[PDB]
Every structure is written in structure tokens, then in C-alpha cells.
Chain length 199, copies 4
Amino acid sequence: SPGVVISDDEPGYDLDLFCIPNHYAEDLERVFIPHGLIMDRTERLARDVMKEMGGHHIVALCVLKGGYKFFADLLDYIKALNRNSDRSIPMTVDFIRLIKVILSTLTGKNVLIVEDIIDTGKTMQTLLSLVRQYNPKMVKVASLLVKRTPRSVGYKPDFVGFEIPDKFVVGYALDYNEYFRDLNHVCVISETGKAKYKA
Amino acid sequence: SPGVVISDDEPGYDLDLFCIPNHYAEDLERVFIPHGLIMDRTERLARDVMKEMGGHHIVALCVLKGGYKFFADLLDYIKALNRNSDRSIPMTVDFIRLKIKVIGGDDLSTLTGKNVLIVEDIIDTGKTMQTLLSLVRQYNPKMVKVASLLVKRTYKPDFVGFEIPDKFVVGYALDYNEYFRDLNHVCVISETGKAKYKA
Amino acid sequence: SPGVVISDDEPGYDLDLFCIPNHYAEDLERVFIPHGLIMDRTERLARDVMKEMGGHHIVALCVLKGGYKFFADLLDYIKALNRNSDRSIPMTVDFIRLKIKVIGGDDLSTLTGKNVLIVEDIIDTGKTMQTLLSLVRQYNPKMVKVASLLVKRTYKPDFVGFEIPDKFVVGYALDYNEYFRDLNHVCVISETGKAKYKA
Amino acid sequence: SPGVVISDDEPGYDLDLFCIPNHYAEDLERVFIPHGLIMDRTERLARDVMKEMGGHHIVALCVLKGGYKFFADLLDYIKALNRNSDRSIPMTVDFIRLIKVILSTLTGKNVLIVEDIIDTGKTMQTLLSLVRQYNPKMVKVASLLVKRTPRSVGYKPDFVGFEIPDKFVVGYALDYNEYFRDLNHVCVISETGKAKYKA
């Protein structure tokens, strides 16, 4: 499944239909993905991940790109799930940066690469090649968002939260020059916000 | 401020009074700090941090030691407060590793003129903290403060969640050989637990 | 304000995209309003209510029809806003039943001079609402407003969560013969579901 | 089990250790039961209830005394639990007022009476007598709080959240003249608050 698909013909929810920090009132266009919807989808991703990767010890390799919300939410749901397991399930949580990756002894384990927004295919291919050099049991990729960029064909993640158009989105785990971290929803930024918070 | 102090005489809560994953029933002695209490205390820490460091650009330096929970919850509460601000205030989140040798998403040069908050789950060695602070201060931060969820008696952080006795606790953000990640409460491990999950 | 409008053409979300209790897998067609979206919308309703009725004593008259969820969530968000108020503002919560004939914790005389908010999960008959409002207004309330989570097309509430087509939905606060209470999302029941849980 | 016992020698947490609405700063003495702790305990009560009453269809008879939080939280945890059941579990939620009770066909079902704070024994005995006239499969009582009043020996609930001293507590589900509903913790009121919010 390509996840929740949001077509190019979808502008997003009018801002007055949701609760948005007052200080961002003119800095956004529409709410594209309400926070609660992100949670609901992520809860399902957690289930899909455990079903396909519960076979061996899982190592969650979270690619740090500025945010932490998606990693925390996905992992929180995963843990809540393993909480009901009849047997104690060990799990490893690592955070890396990207290219060059920053003692990876993930040998004989199921590696789950986690990203907020999937990057180019060449970057993803390179990361997959690097990880496979450690002889993991398996390697899967989960991304909250996948953008349909007009450029080359992007990577196809194993677990996808939402497939969205090529829009400049902020919020949840997508800051803009360190602004919008307090915005819980994924929203489209306005020209006003773009200028106001430009580096 | 020592934070919530838990005396050495404090036995803790009996396991039967709380919801604990069945697969850990024999691996724990009792509940020391219920998840809910951790959350409530962390929400106050958020307010204290914002009271002293709010209104300006805060850079949260989270020292990775295997857990993410405390960082996530503290940051979530901080962001919830930042939302009601009349003016949009930027905030930087950076998960770094120690050994001097800091692995961050950007040079420490960006710390100049900012309010730096170092966050940790627990501070074992005080010397390592004294060193990190010295390094940070070399870049002329506006201010530098330290927040720690726990402090084991026998460095004094600016913001402390709980001060507990020197006991072997696990849960919330203190995994044991990658076990207990699914345990939301901070509890004292049992002899059975230590041996069972020993590396 | 019609609130979030869901067109008659809107098919809804496929069941495989969300977390649904396994015992309901064959009892539903699809997810119409994800729990998270309901929460986000309700949080905005809270703000709208406080914007127009805040600052004064609000009496929330919740019309019991079998569910409590919507009342609880709306009230929780309202209370969360009331907390930041510089002055303490009292608020009364009263769960009443209709048939005229109102069963409340206190006489309607206490409604005099107060801001009355009637809350419902869904308004089936508009006449019953017109009658209730007439009764309430007889006690000279400062104002009287109505909030409803859902409005089925073919009375216009002051605060509406979602406007959906005339379909048989269950979940969140719409049980079916005491079934679906554990279903957090609002979904369309299936033919299998209707027969299986029929009274 | 008598639940979480809080002795008469316990004054409660200093207010500056937790997050309290600013407008109640001088209106309270101490935080007696942090909100998060109430949740954790209630989660366990939900488990205890299902284990002993999961045998037959359960009817939750919530005694309205002004609040709704405990009913909502207990029922939310119960539902989250029945969510993982291999078979669909039907459940009925009713709200009554008290004495005289306000079509009780709870025949052949397990009745769970729910209260925030257990009332006198004669009142509880009377309610139990009234309910048993409908020939229910069983009748159990759950109360968030039980106060050790100096008067006659109170009733002994089947499920008890916390057993507390005879202190004037407010918050969570215990309003005082409609104030403190926005206070999430159970706290001891001050003489200042008592006078300020007196009817």
C-alpha cells in the first residue's frame, strides 16, 4: 500500500476549521494533515511494522533531519503493542545522521530505517547499501511522508504514512528555520510565513 | 531545587496497584515512579524551563544514552507552552552524543547568543557534565542550563525531575540490554530480572 | 458554519489504512471520520465556544443518548483553555435526559444569567431542539447555544463538528445495540455488521 | 486490596512541584494526587474490573455527583482493553442520579456502580438494594476515592482507586461551587480558596 494518498487537487483544510497557534495565523495556507490523523495512521504503521518485522529483534534507525515527533510517535505505538506480548520483546532505538552515516552491530537483526519525509532515491539507495554491509536479517524503510516530486522517480518505502503533492509543508516534524515546531499539524506555508521566517 | 525527592526509606508502590506488562511480572520489585507522575513532573519542568529560558531562541541539546522518551515528553510540553506565545519564538532541537567530541546537526557556533538547554535522562558522572558545559560556554551562549529527569544521590542540574536513591531502576527511558522499553513506569528491577535479561 | 463538510461523493478511508479492532473487521465498510480528526475538530470547537461564551459562567447541558465520549472530549478541551485564564471562571456540567421533561442535577432556575451550552452527539429531530431551547430561554439565560459533533443532511447548531451524508455510522459515541463502543473512529457499518449485532 | 493508601501523616506535594492553573495559586494547599497517578491507578482498576466482571455483559452505572472525568477515564481504559478481545464485547453505559434513582432492565448482567467518592454506608446499602431488585447477574462498586471519615464505618468498595484521609479535596472530578473543574489534579483546598469560591 502507498499509504494515505492526498491528490494534487486537494488544497487542504481551511485554517479556521482547526486549532492553530495564533502567532502562525498568517504564516500558513491550509492544514494538510491534521495532527490526529497523523497519529491514527502512525498507529496502523506500527501494527504493519510489527507484523512484518516482529520475526527478529528490531533496530529502529531514525534518520535525524531536525524533528523527533514521528520517531517518538511511531516508537510509542510500537511499544504499546509489544506491551501485550506474552514474551518480552527486546528492541533497539538508534538515531543517525546523514553521504556518511553517524558500533553498528545490527547483524542478525531486522533493521527499520525511519524517516519523516523520504529523500531522493540515490540517497536512499546509498543508505541501504551502507546498512547491508553489516549483514542485517532484513532492512525495511518507513516514512511518514512521501512527496510526488516532478523530478526523477523517488524511492518506494515499505511503510508509508501519507503520499503528498510537491507542496512546501511545515509542522509536526518539519520546521522552517526552527519555526513551526510548536505547530502539531502538517500544513502548507504561506508566502508571508516564508518571508517572515526566512533565514 | 532537588525536585521531587524520594527518600531511601521509600519502598515504592506494590506492583499489583498498577498496570504492568505481564511479561515483566517477575522481573520487577515494585514501581518507584508511575508514568503519570513522571508526566506531571515533566510538565512542571517545561514551565520552569520556559519561565527562565523562554522568550528567546532555545537550543535543546539532548544527550542520547539509549532513550528518547524523556526528551520527547519534555519537548512536547515545552512546545505546548510556546504555542500560546503572542510572538513566534524559534526553537532548535538537536540530539547529540558525547565522546571533546559532540555529534550534532550543526556547529556549536550556532549556539552563540542562544539559550542552551542540555537534557539528560540521568547524570552518572558530574565531571563529564562540567566538561560539556565548559565546551558550550566557549561559544558565548546567552545562557546554559541543565535538565535531568533523575538524579541519583551519592553535578546539580538546574531542573531536576526526581531525586531517587542509588537503586537499579529500569523503565520509561532506562532500558536494560534493550529490555523494559515497553515498561512506562520507572521501577526497581528484581534479581530474576537482572539475570534473565543480562547481556 | 457547517463545520467540516463531508460530501455525499466522499467514499471514506479504506479500513486497511487505520487501526481497527479485529473483531469488527467484517462489520464495517470504511472509516468516515478518524478518531484523531474528531479530536482535532473538537479542540477547535472548544476554542469557538470559549471565544463566544467564555469569560462568563458556562453551563454545559449534555443530552444523553448513550454516549459520553463527545461530551468528555469537548469539555476536556474547554477546561484546558479555561486553565490559562487570569481570573478563575466557574463552569457547570450537567448530563440531562429529554422526555417538557428534563432530568438535571439542579433546577433550570440556576440557568438564569448564565451562558448555556447544549451539547449533543447528533441532532436527529430539529423540533425536539426547538422545544428544548424554548424551555431554556424561559429562565432568562444570558445566552443559549448548541454544539453537535455531527449533523446529517436531509436545526442548524451554533457549533458543528462534521456535516456528513445520511449514512448509518457507528463508533466514537454512536453505539449499535451496545456494540462499537470500543471503536474509536466513526465508520459506516456493513450489512454483515447490522445483522450480526441487530437487537 | 484497599487500593493506594495515603496515610493521615501525608500532607501532599508542594504546589511548586507541579503544574497548577495560575488562578488557583493561593486557593490550594498541596497536590494530593497528581493527575497522572490517577490515570495510572484507573488503568489498573479497568484491568481488575474486566478480569472479575468480563464474564457477562457489563452495565456501567455511573452515579452523577457533578463530575464526569473518572467515569470517562475508567470507561476509556476499559474500552481500550476490550479492543483487543478476539470476540466483540457489548457494554452498556448509563448515568444515574441519587434516596431515589433516576427502563433499568439490567437483568442477567454484571452491574458496575461507579462513583468518584464513596458515600455513606446507608446510602450505598440502599442503592445496592434497589439495584438487586432487577435481578442482575452480579453487582460490584468501583470508587476513585474512599475517605476515612471519623464517623461510622463507611462502605467497602470492590474496586478502590485511592484511600485518603478526611481532607477537603477538589479537582479532577470534585468541583467546589463549580470552581476547580479545570484543575486536573486532586488537591487540598486552602482557607483562601474556600472563602473566595464559597456559594
